[PDB]
Amino acid sequence: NLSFTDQHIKFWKKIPKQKAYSTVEQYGQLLDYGRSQGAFVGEGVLPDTNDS
Amino acid sequence: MLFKYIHDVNAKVEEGRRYLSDVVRVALDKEETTDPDTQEVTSTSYRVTAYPVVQVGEEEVPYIPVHPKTAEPGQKVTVPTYDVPEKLPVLVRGRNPEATGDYDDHIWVTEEVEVRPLVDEVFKEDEFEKARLYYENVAAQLAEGDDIRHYYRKDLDREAGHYSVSRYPSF
């Protein structure tokens, strides 16, 4: 034999495997916690609103 | 002014420094930039503003009845007119320079301050619907019975999820 063997496969044996249940798979991400606003408000002042 | 709206605020709102008057006007109008050489429009935009106004006079306008009421063919009603004042008064604590004792030292004094717009935004010609939505949102916020709190616009915000730029201090 002048070609490769099974021991020359590295990445395929190390990547984790998860079972699939459909042709299309979905997942969700959390990009950020909020926007770049100020945090100092003052005495008796309602703070600004923020969203993720 | 393509659209105009008059709202009466309560005592809690009037106490704030941004609402020193008692009536708020919300408007939406269209601006044109004209070529100086010949009359020819070069750019068009829509502006949404909001000012604390004061009454200056009266005028007669057509009557528009509501469900329980009915109007004559030529009935008219009189409504006040409003204008933006230059300054509005405040009340702040002070001290009498020539107080003779302990009973006439602390007093209250009045000052005048500059009046600034509550809302000032600019929209492009091809974004009329967004300007209309913004105007309706401002009107609804005023109708809720409190201060105007939401000024957010999605177009003018920085990118989200770009951790190499948003890590810098913003406070």
PDB file of all heavy atoms in Angstrom, chain A residues 30-32 34-40 46-49 51, chain B residues 146 149-150 152 157-163 166 168 170-171:
ATOM      1  N   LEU A  30     -27.091  35.164  22.050  1.00  0.00           N
ATOM      2  CA  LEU A  30     -27.229  36.390  22.831  1.00  0.00           C
ATOM      3  C   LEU A  30     -26.091  37.318  22.428  1.00  0.00           C
ATOM      4  O   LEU A  30     -24.950  37.136  22.865  1.00  0.00           O
ATOM      5  CB  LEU A  30     -27.201  36.093  24.331  1.00  0.00           C
ATOM      6  CG  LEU A  30     -27.748  37.158  25.287  1.00  0.00           C
ATOM      7  CD1 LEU A  30     -28.268  36.501  26.555  1.00  0.00           C
ATOM      8  CD2 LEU A  30     -26.699  38.198  25.627  1.00  0.00           C
ATOM      9  N   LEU A  31     -26.403  38.314  21.597  1.00  0.00           N
ATOM     10  CA  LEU A  31     -25.360  39.155  21.018  1.00  0.00           C
ATOM     11  C   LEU A  31     -24.783  40.139  22.028  1.00  0.00           C
ATOM     12  O   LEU A  31     -23.560  40.325  22.085  1.00  0.00           O
ATOM     13  CB  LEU A  31     -25.907  39.902  19.804  1.00  0.00           C
ATOM     14  CG  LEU A  31     -25.559  39.309  18.436  1.00  0.00           C
ATOM     15  CD1 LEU A  31     -25.981  37.853  18.347  1.00  0.00           C
ATOM     16  CD2 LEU A  31     -26.207  40.122  17.329  1.00  0.00           C
ATOM     17  N   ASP A  32     -25.629  40.778  22.832  1.00  0.00           N
ATOM     18  CA  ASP A  32     -25.154  41.813  23.739  1.00  0.00           C
ATOM     19  C   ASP A  32     -26.163  42.000  24.863  1.00  0.00           C
ATOM     20  O   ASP A  32     -27.293  41.514  24.795  1.00  0.00           O
ATOM     21  CB  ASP A  32     -24.921  43.138  23.004  1.00  0.00           C
ATOM     22  CG  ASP A  32     -23.673  43.854  23.477  1.00  0.00           C
ATOM     23  OD1 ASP A  32     -23.230  43.594  24.617  1.00  0.00           O
ATOM     24  OD2 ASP A  32     -23.130  44.675  22.708  1.00  0.00           O
ATOM     25  N   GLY A  34     -26.802  45.250  26.160  1.00  0.00           N
ATOM     26  CA  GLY A  34     -27.412  46.558  26.074  1.00  0.00           C
ATOM     27  C   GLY A  34     -26.641  47.443  25.114  1.00  0.00           C
ATOM     28  O   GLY A  34     -25.710  46.997  24.440  1.00  0.00           O
ATOM     29  N   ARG A  35     -27.047  48.705  25.069  1.00  0.00           N
ATOM     30  CA  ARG A  35     -26.422  49.700  24.215  1.00  0.00           C
ATOM     31  C   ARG A  35     -25.398  50.512  25.002  1.00  0.00           C
ATOM     32  O   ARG A  35     -25.244  50.362  26.216  1.00  0.00           O
ATOM     33  CB  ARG A  35     -27.480  50.620  23.598  1.00  0.00           C
ATOM     34  CG  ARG A  35     -28.529  49.884  22.784  1.00  0.00           C
ATOM     35  CD  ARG A  35     -29.379  50.841  21.968  1.00  0.00           C
ATOM     36  NE  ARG A  35     -30.189  51.716  22.809  1.00  0.00           N
ATOM     37  CZ  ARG A  35     -31.379  51.391  23.297  1.00  0.00           C
ATOM     38  NH1 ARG A  35     -31.921  50.207  23.065  1.00  0.00           N
ATOM     39  NH2 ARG A  35     -32.039  52.276  24.037  1.00  0.00           N
ATOM     40  N   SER A  36     -24.688  51.382  24.284  1.00  0.00           N
ATOM     41  CA  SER A  36     -23.651  52.219  24.883  1.00  0.00           C
ATOM     42  C   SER A  36     -24.255  53.574  25.233  1.00  0.00           C
ATOM     43  O   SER A  36     -24.136  54.558  24.499  1.00  0.00           O
ATOM     44  CB  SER A  36     -22.460  52.353  23.942  1.00  0.00           C
ATOM     45  OG  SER A  36     -21.913  51.085  23.632  1.00  0.00           O
ATOM     46  N   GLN A  37     -24.916  53.620  26.380  1.00  0.00           N
ATOM     47  CA  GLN A  37     -25.501  54.839  26.918  1.00  0.00           C
ATOM     48  C   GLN A  37     -24.753  55.256  28.179  1.00  0.00           C
ATOM     49  O   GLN A  37     -23.752  54.651  28.570  1.00  0.00           O
ATOM     50  CB  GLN A  37     -26.986  54.645  27.221  1.00  0.00           C
ATOM     51  CG  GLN A  37     -27.828  54.215  26.043  1.00  0.00           C
ATOM     52  CD  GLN A  37     -29.239  53.864  26.456  1.00  0.00           C
ATOM     53  OE1 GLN A  37     -29.477  53.432  27.583  1.00  0.00           O
ATOM     54  NE2 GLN A  37     -30.186  54.056  25.547  1.00  0.00           N
ATOM     55  N   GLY A  38     -25.259  56.308  28.819  1.00  0.00           N
ATOM     56  CA  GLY A  38     -24.763  56.698  30.118  1.00  0.00           C
ATOM     57  C   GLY A  38     -25.492  55.996  31.247  1.00  0.00           C
ATOM     58  O   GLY A  38     -26.600  55.489  31.080  1.00  0.00           O
ATOM     59  N   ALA A  39     -24.852  55.970  32.417  1.00  0.00           N
ATOM     60  CA  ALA A  39     -25.430  55.347  33.598  1.00  0.00           C
ATOM     61  C   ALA A  39     -25.667  56.309  34.748  1.00  0.00           C
ATOM     62  O   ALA A  39     -26.448  55.981  35.648  1.00  0.00           O
ATOM     63  CB  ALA A  39     -24.541  54.197  34.096  1.00  0.00           C
ATOM     64  N   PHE A  40     -25.026  57.473  34.753  1.00  0.00           N
ATOM     65  CA  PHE A  40     -25.231  58.448  35.812  1.00  0.00           C
ATOM     66  C   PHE A  40     -26.479  59.270  35.519  1.00  0.00           C
ATOM     67  O   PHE A  40     -26.662  59.770  34.408  1.00  0.00           O
ATOM     68  CB  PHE A  40     -24.010  59.356  35.936  1.00  0.00           C
ATOM     69  CG  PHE A  40     -22.775  58.641  36.399  1.00  0.00           C
ATOM     70  CD1 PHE A  40     -21.849  58.170  35.486  1.00  0.00           C
ATOM     71  CD2 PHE A  40     -22.544  58.433  37.747  1.00  0.00           C
ATOM     72  CE1 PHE A  40     -20.712  57.513  35.908  1.00  0.00           C
ATOM     73  CE2 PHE A  40     -21.413  57.772  38.173  1.00  0.00           C
ATOM     74  CZ  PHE A  40     -20.496  57.311  37.254  1.00  0.00           C
ATOM     75  N   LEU A  46     -35.551  59.576  36.760  1.00  0.00           N
ATOM     76  CA  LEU A  46     -35.815  58.243  36.229  1.00  0.00           C
ATOM     77  C   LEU A  46     -34.736  57.854  35.223  1.00  0.00           C
ATOM     78  O   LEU A  46     -34.466  58.615  34.284  1.00  0.00           O
ATOM     79  CB  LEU A  46     -37.193  58.204  35.574  1.00  0.00           C
ATOM     80  CG  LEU A  46     -37.555  56.968  34.752  1.00  0.00           C
ATOM     81  CD1 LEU A  46     -37.689  55.748  35.643  1.00  0.00           C
ATOM     82  CD2 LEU A  46     -38.838  57.206  33.975  1.00  0.00           C
ATOM     83  N   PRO A  47     -34.098  56.697  35.381  1.00  0.00           N
ATOM     84  CA  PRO A  47     -33.049  56.294  34.439  1.00  0.00           C
ATOM     85  C   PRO A  47     -33.607  55.934  33.071  1.00  0.00           C
ATOM     86  O   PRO A  47     -34.796  55.653  32.901  1.00  0.00           O
ATOM     87  CB  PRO A  47     -32.416  55.071  35.116  1.00  0.00           C
ATOM     88  CG  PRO A  47     -32.806  55.183  36.556  1.00  0.00           C
ATOM     89  CD  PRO A  47     -34.168  55.797  36.541  1.00  0.00           C
ATOM     90  N   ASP A  48     -32.715  55.942  32.085  1.00  0.00           N
ATOM     91  CA  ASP A  48     -33.081  55.610  30.717  1.00  0.00           C
ATOM     92  C   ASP A  48     -33.357  54.115  30.574  1.00  0.00           C
ATOM     93  O   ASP A  48     -32.926  53.293  31.388  1.00  0.00           O
ATOM     94  CB  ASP A  48     -31.971  56.020  29.750  1.00  0.00           C
ATOM     95  CG  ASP A  48     -31.747  57.514  29.720  1.00  0.00           C
ATOM     96  OD1 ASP A  48     -30.924  58.010  30.518  1.00  0.00           O
ATOM     97  OD2 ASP A  48     -32.392  58.195  28.897  1.00  0.00           O
ATOM     98  N   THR A  49     -34.087  53.770  29.517  1.00  0.00           N
ATOM     99  CA  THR A  49     -34.385  52.382  29.206  1.00  0.00           C
ATOM    100  C   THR A  49     -33.320  51.807  28.279  1.00  0.00           C
ATOM    101  O   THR A  49     -32.669  52.532  27.524  1.00  0.00           O
ATOM    102  CB  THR A  49     -35.762  52.250  28.554  1.00  0.00           C
ATOM    103  OG1 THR A  49     -35.751  52.898  27.278  1.00  0.00           O
ATOM    104  CG2 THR A  49     -36.823  52.889  29.428  1.00  0.00           C
ATOM    105  N   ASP A  51     -32.138  47.862  26.107  1.00  0.00           N
ATOM    106  CA  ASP A  51     -32.586  46.566  25.618  1.00  0.00           C
ATOM    107  C   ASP A  51     -31.390  45.773  25.108  1.00  0.00           C
ATOM    108  O   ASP A  51     -30.368  46.339  24.711  1.00  0.00           O
ATOM    109  CB  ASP A  51     -33.636  46.717  24.511  1.00  0.00           C
ATOM    110  CG  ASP A  51     -35.024  46.979  25.058  1.00  0.00           C
ATOM    111  OD1 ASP A  51     -35.713  46.006  25.429  1.00  0.00           O
ATOM    112  OD2 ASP A  51     -35.431  48.160  25.116  1.00  0.00           O
TER     113      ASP A  51
ATOM    114  N   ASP B 146     -47.463  61.264  31.063  1.00  0.00           N
ATOM    115  CA  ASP B 146     -46.164  61.410  31.703  1.00  0.00           C
ATOM    116  C   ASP B 146     -45.219  62.091  30.718  1.00  0.00           C
ATOM    117  O   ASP B 146     -45.631  62.554  29.652  1.00  0.00           O
ATOM    118  CB  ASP B 146     -45.642  60.046  32.176  1.00  0.00           C
ATOM    119  CG  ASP B 146     -44.565  60.167  33.236  1.00  0.00           C
ATOM    120  OD1 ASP B 146     -44.744  60.963  34.179  1.00  0.00           O
ATOM    121  OD2 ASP B 146     -43.536  59.470  33.122  1.00  0.00           O
ATOM    122  N   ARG B 149     -40.300  59.720  27.044  1.00  0.00           N
ATOM    123  CA  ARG B 149     -39.229  58.888  27.574  1.00  0.00           C
ATOM    124  C   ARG B 149     -38.445  58.120  26.522  1.00  0.00           C
ATOM    125  O   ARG B 149     -37.269  57.833  26.748  1.00  0.00           O
ATOM    126  CB  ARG B 149     -39.794  57.891  28.597  1.00  0.00           C
ATOM    127  CG  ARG B 149     -40.432  58.554  29.807  1.00  0.00           C
ATOM    128  CD  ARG B 149     -41.010  57.531  30.775  1.00  0.00           C
ATOM    129  NE  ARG B 149     -41.749  56.474  30.097  1.00  0.00           N
ATOM    130  CZ  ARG B 149     -42.955  56.622  29.564  1.00  0.00           C
ATOM    131  NH1 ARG B 149     -43.595  57.779  29.612  1.00  0.00           N
ATOM    132  NH2 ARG B 149     -43.536  55.582  28.976  1.00  0.00           N
ATOM    133  N   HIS B 150     -39.051  57.776  25.388  1.00  0.00           N
ATOM    134  CA  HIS B 150     -38.405  56.949  24.376  1.00  0.00           C
ATOM    135  C   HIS B 150     -38.017  57.810  23.183  1.00  0.00           C
ATOM    136  O   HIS B 150     -38.886  58.350  22.490  1.00  0.00           O
ATOM    137  CB  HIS B 150     -39.322  55.807  23.943  1.00  0.00           C
ATOM    138  CG  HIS B 150     -39.860  55.001  25.084  1.00  0.00           C
ATOM    139  ND1 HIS B 150     -39.059  54.522  26.097  1.00  0.00           N
ATOM    140  CD2 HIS B 150     -41.116  54.588  25.370  1.00  0.00           C
ATOM    141  CE1 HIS B 150     -39.800  53.849  26.961  1.00  0.00           C
ATOM    142  NE2 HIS B 150     -41.052  53.874  26.541  1.00  0.00           N
ATOM    143  N   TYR B 152     -35.503  56.440  21.021  1.00  0.00           N
ATOM    144  CA  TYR B 152     -34.656  55.517  20.278  1.00  0.00           C
ATOM    145  C   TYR B 152     -35.025  55.473  18.801  1.00  0.00           C
ATOM    146  O   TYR B 152     -36.202  55.509  18.433  1.00  0.00           O
ATOM    147  CB  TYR B 152     -34.760  54.118  20.882  1.00  0.00           C
ATOM    148  CG  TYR B 152     -33.946  53.069  20.162  1.00  0.00           C
ATOM    149  CD1 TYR B 152     -32.570  53.190  20.047  1.00  0.00           C
ATOM    150  CD2 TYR B 152     -34.557  51.954  19.603  1.00  0.00           C
ATOM    151  CE1 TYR B 152     -31.824  52.231  19.393  1.00  0.00           C
ATOM    152  CE2 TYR B 152     -33.819  50.991  18.947  1.00  0.00           C
ATOM    153  CZ  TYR B 152     -32.454  51.133  18.845  1.00  0.00           C
ATOM    154  OH  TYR B 152     -31.715  50.176  18.192  1.00  0.00           O
ATOM    155  N   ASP B 157     -28.221  54.057  15.363  1.00  0.00           N
ATOM    156  CA  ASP B 157     -27.518  53.341  16.416  1.00  0.00           C
ATOM    157  C   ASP B 157     -26.287  52.631  15.857  1.00  0.00           C
ATOM    158  O   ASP B 157     -26.218  52.286  14.676  1.00  0.00           O
ATOM    159  CB  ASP B 157     -28.446  52.331  17.093  1.00  0.00           C
ATOM    160  CG  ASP B 157     -27.833  51.719  18.337  1.00  0.00           C
ATOM    161  OD1 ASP B 157     -27.261  52.474  19.152  1.00  0.00           O
ATOM    162  OD2 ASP B 157     -27.920  50.484  18.498  1.00  0.00           O
ATOM    163  N   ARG B 158     -25.307  52.420  16.732  1.00  0.00           N
ATOM    164  CA  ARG B 158     -24.097  51.706  16.367  1.00  0.00           C
ATOM    165  C   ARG B 158     -24.375  50.208  16.251  1.00  0.00           C
ATOM    166  O   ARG B 158     -25.404  49.701  16.705  1.00  0.00           O
ATOM    167  CB  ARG B 158     -22.992  51.958  17.393  1.00  0.00           C
ATOM    168  CG  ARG B 158     -22.632  53.421  17.570  1.00  0.00           C
ATOM    169  CD  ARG B 158     -21.708  53.623  18.757  1.00  0.00           C
ATOM    170  NE  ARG B 158     -21.248  55.002  18.864  1.00  0.00           N
ATOM    171  CZ  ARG B 158     -20.504  55.470  19.856  1.00  0.00           C
ATOM    172  NH1 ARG B 158     -20.115  54.695  20.854  1.00  0.00           N
ATOM    173  NH2 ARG B 158     -20.141  56.748  19.848  1.00  0.00           N
ATOM    174  N   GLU B 159     -23.433  49.500  15.634  1.00  0.00           N
ATOM    175  CA  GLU B 159     -23.598  48.073  15.404  1.00  0.00           C
ATOM    176  C   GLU B 159     -23.565  47.298  16.717  1.00  0.00           C
ATOM    177  O   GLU B 159     -22.851  47.653  17.659  1.00  0.00           O
ATOM    178  CB  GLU B 159     -22.510  47.553  14.467  1.00  0.00           C
ATOM    179  CG  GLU B 159     -22.089  48.542  13.397  1.00  0.00           C
ATOM    180  CD  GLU B 159     -20.946  48.026  12.545  1.00  0.00           C
ATOM    181  OE1 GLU B 159     -20.442  46.921  12.831  1.00  0.00           O
ATOM    182  OE2 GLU B 159     -20.555  48.726  11.588  1.00  0.00           O
ATOM    183  N   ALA B 160     -24.351  46.229  16.769  1.00  0.00           N
ATOM    184  CA  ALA B 160     -24.429  45.365  17.937  1.00  0.00           C
ATOM    185  C   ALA B 160     -23.651  44.081  17.690  1.00  0.00           C
ATOM    186  O   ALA B 160     -23.642  43.552  16.574  1.00  0.00           O
ATOM    187  CB  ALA B 160     -25.884  45.036  18.279  1.00  0.00           C
ATOM    188  N   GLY B 161     -22.998  43.583  18.737  1.00  0.00           N
ATOM    189  CA  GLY B 161     -22.207  42.377  18.639  1.00  0.00           C
ATOM    190  C   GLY B 161     -20.788  42.571  18.154  1.00  0.00           C
ATOM    191  O   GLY B 161     -20.067  41.579  17.996  1.00  0.00           O
ATOM    192  N   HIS B 162     -20.362  43.812  17.913  1.00  0.00           N
ATOM    193  CA  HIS B 162     -18.993  44.097  17.486  1.00  0.00           C
ATOM    194  C   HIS B 162     -18.169  44.406  18.733  1.00  0.00           C
ATOM    195  O   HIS B 162     -17.972  45.556  19.127  1.00  0.00           O
ATOM    196  CB  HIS B 162     -18.971  45.243  16.483  1.00  0.00           C
ATOM    197  CG  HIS B 162     -17.694  45.346  15.711  1.00  0.00           C
ATOM    198  ND1 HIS B 162     -17.444  46.369  14.822  1.00  0.00           N
ATOM    199  CD2 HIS B 162     -16.597  44.555  15.694  1.00  0.00           C
ATOM    200  CE1 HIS B 162     -16.247  46.204  14.290  1.00  0.00           C
ATOM    201  NE2 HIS B 162     -15.711  45.111  14.802  1.00  0.00           N
ATOM    202  N   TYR B 163     -17.679  43.334  19.362  1.00  0.00           N
ATOM    203  CA  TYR B 163     -17.047  43.442  20.673  1.00  0.00           C
ATOM    204  C   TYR B 163     -15.748  44.235  20.650  1.00  0.00           C
ATOM    205  O   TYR B 163     -15.318  44.718  21.702  1.00  0.00           O
ATOM    206  CB  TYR B 163     -16.785  42.046  21.237  1.00  0.00           C
ATOM    207  CG  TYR B 163     -18.019  41.179  21.286  1.00  0.00           C
ATOM    208  CD1 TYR B 163     -18.074  39.980  20.594  1.00  0.00           C
ATOM    209  CD2 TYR B 163     -19.132  41.563  22.021  1.00  0.00           C
ATOM    210  CE1 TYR B 163     -19.198  39.183  20.635  1.00  0.00           C
ATOM    211  CE2 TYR B 163     -20.260  40.776  22.069  1.00  0.00           C
ATOM    212  CZ  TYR B 163     -20.290  39.588  21.373  1.00  0.00           C
ATOM    213  OH  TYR B 163     -21.415  38.800  21.419  1.00  0.00           O
ATOM    214  N   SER B 166     -17.240  48.108  20.971  1.00  0.00           N
ATOM    215  CA  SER B 166     -18.099  48.444  22.099  1.00  0.00           C
ATOM    216  C   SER B 166     -17.429  48.220  23.449  1.00  0.00           C
ATOM    217  O   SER B 166     -18.043  48.519  24.479  1.00  0.00           O
ATOM    218  CB  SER B 166     -19.399  47.639  22.031  1.00  0.00           C
ATOM    219  OG  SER B 166     -19.175  46.279  22.352  1.00  0.00           O
ATOM    220  N   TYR B 168     -14.834  49.856  24.492  1.00  0.00           N
ATOM    221  CA  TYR B 168     -14.289  51.114  24.968  1.00  0.00           C
ATOM    222  C   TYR B 168     -15.279  51.798  25.907  1.00  0.00           C
ATOM    223  O   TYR B 168     -16.492  51.587  25.802  1.00  0.00           O
ATOM    224  CB  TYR B 168     -13.953  52.024  23.789  1.00  0.00           C
ATOM    225  CG  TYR B 168     -12.761  51.544  22.998  1.00  0.00           C
ATOM    226  CD1 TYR B 168     -12.924  50.928  21.765  1.00  0.00           C
ATOM    227  CD2 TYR B 168     -11.472  51.695  23.488  1.00  0.00           C
ATOM    228  CE1 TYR B 168     -11.837  50.483  21.041  1.00  0.00           C
ATOM    229  CE2 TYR B 168     -10.380  51.252  22.772  1.00  0.00           C
ATOM    230  CZ  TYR B 168     -10.568  50.647  21.551  1.00  0.00           C
ATOM    231  OH  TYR B 168      -9.482  50.205  20.832  1.00  0.00           O
ATOM    232  N   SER B 170     -17.986  53.886  27.785  1.00  0.00           N
ATOM    233  CA  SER B 170     -19.128  54.714  27.424  1.00  0.00           C
ATOM    234  C   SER B 170     -19.902  55.235  28.622  1.00  0.00           C
ATOM    235  O   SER B 170     -20.666  56.195  28.462  1.00  0.00           O
ATOM    236  CB  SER B 170     -20.092  53.939  26.513  1.00  0.00           C
ATOM    237  OG  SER B 170     -20.666  52.840  27.199  1.00  0.00           O
ATOM    238  N   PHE B 171     -19.744  54.634  29.798  1.00  0.00           N
ATOM    239  CA  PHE B 171     -20.364  55.094  31.038  1.00  0.00           C
ATOM    240  C   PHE B 171     -21.881  55.040  30.965  1.00  0.00           C
ATOM    241  O   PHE B 171     -22.562  55.356  31.938  1.00  0.00           O
ATOM    242  CB  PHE B 171     -19.907  56.515  31.380  1.00  0.00           C
ATOM    243  CG  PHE B 171     -18.517  56.585  31.934  1.00  0.00           C
ATOM    244  CD1 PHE B 171     -17.453  56.035  31.243  1.00  0.00           C
ATOM    245  CD2 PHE B 171     -18.272  57.208  33.141  1.00  0.00           C
ATOM    246  CE1 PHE B 171     -16.177  56.100  31.744  1.00  0.00           C
ATOM    247  CE2 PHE B 171     -16.994  57.276  33.648  1.00  0.00           C
ATOM    248  CZ  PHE B 171     -15.948  56.719  32.947  1.00  0.00           C
TER     249      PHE B 171
END
